[PDB]
Amino acid sequence: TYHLDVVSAEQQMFSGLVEKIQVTGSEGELGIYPGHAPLLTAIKPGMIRIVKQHGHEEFIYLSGGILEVQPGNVTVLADTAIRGQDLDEARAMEAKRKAEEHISSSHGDVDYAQASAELAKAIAQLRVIELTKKAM
């Protein structure tokens, strides 16, 4: 057996011991057994099959990534979203538009909003200084 990592930029996805894997490399299907020579390739979006030792089979969906295999080791630097020349250019276009305008969104921290507004009403017009003879 050998060690397999499926790692995204955000969080890890698999860290077990494996007997073999099957992937779609960009240049075709590819099946890594133990001891396999060092290799580096992209992988296409789609499923990877793991057979954990004792023969347990499972399927992991990957939005892409890079596969790198080493003496006794392999890693799949999986992408977290579909990547492409057009999708990424559309996202950059929206990121540019939002800056050429002055449009901004609202954070989802409703807890911060509640506490912020309660504190803003509570602290308003205390008149506590001059009432307290603190100079400062």
């Binding site: 609202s106 954070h107 409703v110 909003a113 509640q114 912020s116 309660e118 009403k121």
Partner: protein
């Protein structure tokens, strides 16, 4: 005298529901202010509108206030009051504008004003 035993369960439930809706709206008001309304959940975006319509509907034109406003006054029976609030809270009038409830008498004037509005 506001308890089920003397006013009946219908009146008591209508009153407690109105107070609960208005309290929930008073809670949501600051989230609306900081975050903006488009962040509220779709059931809270409905509590807001229904509370805002309740808050309009319990205003009323008086016969003696006419010299202040010129508009005629209206007398509303308790049955019509309960029927109107019980309808609003249950969503029977989610299709009317808010200003259809402002300074009206019975709910019939609300539907007729919206039809005119």
């Amino acid at each position: 005298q506001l308890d089920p035993l003397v006013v009946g369960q219908e009146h008591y439930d209508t009153a407690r529901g109105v107070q609960s809706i208005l309290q929930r709206y008073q809670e949501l008001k600051d989230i609306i202010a900081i975050l903006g309304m488009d962040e509220l959940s779709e059931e809270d975006k409905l509590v807001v509108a229904r509370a805002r319509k309740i808050q309009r509907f319990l205003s009323q034109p008086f016969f003696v206030a006419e010299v202040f406003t010129g508009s005629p006054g209206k007398y509303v029976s308790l049955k019509d009051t309960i029927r109107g609030f019980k309808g609003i809270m249950e969503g029977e009038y989610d299709h009317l504008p808010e200003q259809a409830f402002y300074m009206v008498g019975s709910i019939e004037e609300a539907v007729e004003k919206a039809k005119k509005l």
